[PDB]
Design an enzyme around this catalytic site. Structure first.
Site, short mmCIF file in Angstrom:
data_model
loop_
_atom_site.label_atom_id
_atom_site.label_comp_id
_atom_site.label_asym_id
_atom_site.label_seq_id
_atom_site.Cartn_x
_atom_site.Cartn_y
_atom_site.Cartn_z
N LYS A 98 1.74 -3.54 8.76
CA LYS A 98 2.87 -2.62 8.84
C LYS A 98 4.15 -3.28 9.37
O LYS A 98 4.17 -3.84 10.46
CB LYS A 98 2.47 -1.46 9.75
CG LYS A 98 3.46 -0.33 9.85
CD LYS A 98 2.87 0.73 10.77
CE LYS A 98 3.62 2.04 10.70
NZ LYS A 98 2.99 3.16 11.43
N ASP B 56 -6.32 8.38 1.47
CA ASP B 56 -5.82 9.29 2.48
C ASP B 56 -6.13 10.74 2.07
O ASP B 56 -6.31 11.03 0.89
CB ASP B 56 -4.37 8.97 2.93
CG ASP B 56 -3.29 9.46 1.97
OD1 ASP B 56 -3.46 10.48 1.27
OD2 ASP B 56 -2.17 8.89 1.92
N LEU C 158 0.81 -1.22 0.00
CA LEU C 158 0.00 0.00 0.00
C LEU C 158 0.84 1.27 0.00
O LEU C 158 0.50 2.24 -0.66
CB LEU C 158 -0.96 0.01 1.19
CG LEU C 158 -2.05 -1.09 1.14
CD1 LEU C 158 -2.82 -1.22 2.44
CD2 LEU C 158 -3.02 -0.83 -0.02
N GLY C 159 1.94 1.26 0.74
CA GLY C 159 2.82 2.41 0.80
C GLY C 159 4.11 2.14 1.55
O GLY C 159 4.28 1.08 2.15
N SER C 160 5.04 3.09 1.49
CA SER C 160 6.29 2.98 2.22
C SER C 160 6.91 4.36 2.45
O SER C 160 6.87 5.21 1.57
CB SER C 160 7.27 2.02 1.54
OG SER C 160 8.25 2.67 0.73
N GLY D 256 7.52 3.05 7.75
CA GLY D 256 7.78 1.65 7.41
C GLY D 256 7.18 1.25 6.06
O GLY D 256 7.08 2.09 5.18
N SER D 257 6.84 -0.03 5.91
CA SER D 257 6.21 -0.57 4.70
C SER D 257 4.86 -1.17 5.11
O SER D 257 4.80 -2.01 5.99
CB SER D 257 7.09 -1.63 4.05
OG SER D 257 8.30 -1.09 3.56
N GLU E 41 -6.48 -2.23 11.33
CA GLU E 41 -7.74 -2.22 10.61
C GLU E 41 -7.50 -1.70 9.22
O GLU E 41 -6.57 -0.92 8.98
CB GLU E 41 -8.74 -1.26 11.25
CG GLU E 41 -9.40 -1.75 12.50
CD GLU E 41 -10.57 -0.86 12.88
OE1 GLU E 41 -11.69 -1.38 13.05
OE2 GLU E 41 -10.34 0.38 12.97
N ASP F 209 1.90 14.19 14.92
CA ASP F 209 2.11 14.22 13.49
C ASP F 209 0.79 14.34 12.74
O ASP F 209 0.59 13.71 11.71
CB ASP F 209 2.91 12.99 13.05
CG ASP F 209 3.62 13.18 11.72
OD1 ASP F 209 3.82 14.35 11.31
OD2 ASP F 209 4.00 12.22 11.02
O1 LIG Z 1 -6.17 0.41 6.38
C1 LIG Z 1 -5.19 1.00 5.98
C2 LIG Z 1 -4.18 1.41 6.96
O2 LIG Z 1 -4.43 1.08 8.23
C3 LIG Z 1 -3.06 2.05 6.59
C4 LIG Z 1 -1.96 2.53 7.52
C5 LIG Z 1 -1.96 2.32 8.90
C6 LIG Z 1 -0.92 2.81 9.69
C7 LIG Z 1 0.14 3.53 9.13
O3 LIG Z 1 1.16 4.01 9.83
C8 LIG Z 1 0.14 3.75 7.68
O4 LIG Z 1 1.15 4.42 7.17
C9 LIG Z 1 -0.91 3.25 6.92
O5 LIG Z 1 -2.85 2.38 5.20
C10 LIG Z 1 -3.74 2.05 4.22
C11 LIG Z 1 -3.48 2.38 2.90
C12 LIG Z 1 -4.39 2.05 1.89
O6 LIG Z 1 -4.11 2.38 0.63
C13 LIG Z 1 -5.57 1.36 2.15
C14 LIG Z 1 -5.91 0.98 3.44
O7 LIG Z 1 -7.04 0.34 3.64
C15 LIG Z 1 -4.98 1.32 4.55
#
Ligand SMILES: O=c1c(O)c(-c2ccc(O)c(O)c2)oc2cc(O)cc(O)c12
Length: 274
Positions: A35, A96, A12-14, A18-19, A89, A135
């Site tokens: 995460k 976002d 989903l992201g990094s 973290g990742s 969750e 943050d």
């Molecule tokens: O459910 C999601 C989620 O909890 C997080 C998340 C939680 C904690 C973090 O520190 C963070 O960076 C991302 O990202 C997401 C990114 C998406 O595209 C879709 C999602 O459904 C989630």
């Protein structure tokens, strides 16, 4: 038990958080976010009730995880030799607030009011649980696009709430208050209100008001978009240079600009087209 209780999906992201991967709890098809955080990159550690060394992030999440849905909840966590894995969750569909603002630009005041109110309710819940996020910003807010509900994420720069001064900060600089820039000292609540002012401006103008240290210290707010006088007034109050001149959470929510908020579901039906 083991990590085998989850099916890993796309990344989903990094970043500094973290990742984070999309995932599904195998036992009941529950959507989750996974995460991964490297042990070497965790600077702030904490202790669990039973004397186990975990990332502060885990301590803070446990303190804010319960019925309320304004914060993404920690469902579980694991320790690996070189990392910690947090199971969180995952609403679906979601986007976002940063991406949402990138795509739609400045938000109508009705939408910014619903969103801002929900952020305030979530921050209050964190503070009531003895947790300071440190943050607050659009990238750390997820929107559940079906229900119109906002959820706070990434507590990795957070800390236990206290009434004494903080001399450490590792959140986002352009959201940090003038007192941190000039003195490396801030108090939790008033610094949070400053970041909330930056966030509100970001919502109604489509971008953050300050980019450089000099701009933050000067505290002069210029509006690039048409914004009602009441909204401008609330923003300028949140961004008062003296911490004590800033509104408390109660004063923010009782402000004239904050009256007649839409419910999250109404918010989605009118503005998220869902
Ligand atoms: O459910 C999601 C989620 O909890 C997080 C998340 C939680 C904690 C973090 O520190 C963070 O960076 C991302 O990202 C997401 C990114 C998406 O595209 C879709 C999602 O459904 C989630």
């Amino acid at each position: 038990p083991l990590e085998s209780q989850y099916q890993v999906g796309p990344l989903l992201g990094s970043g500094g958080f973290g990742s984070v991967y999309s995932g599904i709890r195998v036992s009941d098809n529950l959507p989750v976010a996974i995460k991964h955080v490297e042990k070497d990159r965790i600077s702030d550690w904490g202790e669990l009730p039973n004397g186990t060394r975990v990332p502060m992030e885990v301590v803070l999440l446990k303190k804010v995880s319960s019925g309320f849905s304004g914060v993404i909840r920690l469902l579980d966590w694991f320790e690996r030799p070189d990392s910690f894995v947090l199971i969180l969750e995952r609403p679906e569909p979601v986007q976002d607030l940063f991406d949402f603002i990138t795509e739609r630009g400045a938000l109508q005041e009705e939408l910014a009011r619903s969103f801002f109110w929900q952020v305030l309710e979530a921050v209050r819940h964190c503070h009531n649980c003895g947790v300071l996020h440190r943050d607050i910003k659009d990238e750390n807010i997820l929107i559940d696009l079906n229900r119109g509900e906002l959820k706070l994420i990434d507590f990795g720069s957070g800390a236990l709430l206290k009434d004494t001064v903080y001399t450490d900060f590792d959140g986002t600089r352009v959201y940090s208050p003038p007192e941190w820039i000039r003195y490396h000292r801030y108090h939790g609540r008033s610094a949070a209100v400053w970041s909330l002012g930056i966030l509100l401006y970001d919502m109604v103008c489509g971008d953050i008001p300050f980019e450089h240290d000099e701009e933050i210290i000067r505290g002069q707010v210029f509006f690039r978009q048409r914004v009602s006088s009441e909204c401008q007034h609330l923003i300028r109050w949140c961004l008062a240079l003296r911490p004590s001149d800033r509104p408390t959470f109660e004063e923010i929510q009782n402000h004239p600009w904050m009256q007649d908020v839409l419910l999250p579901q109404e918010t989605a039906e009118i503005h998220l087209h869902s």
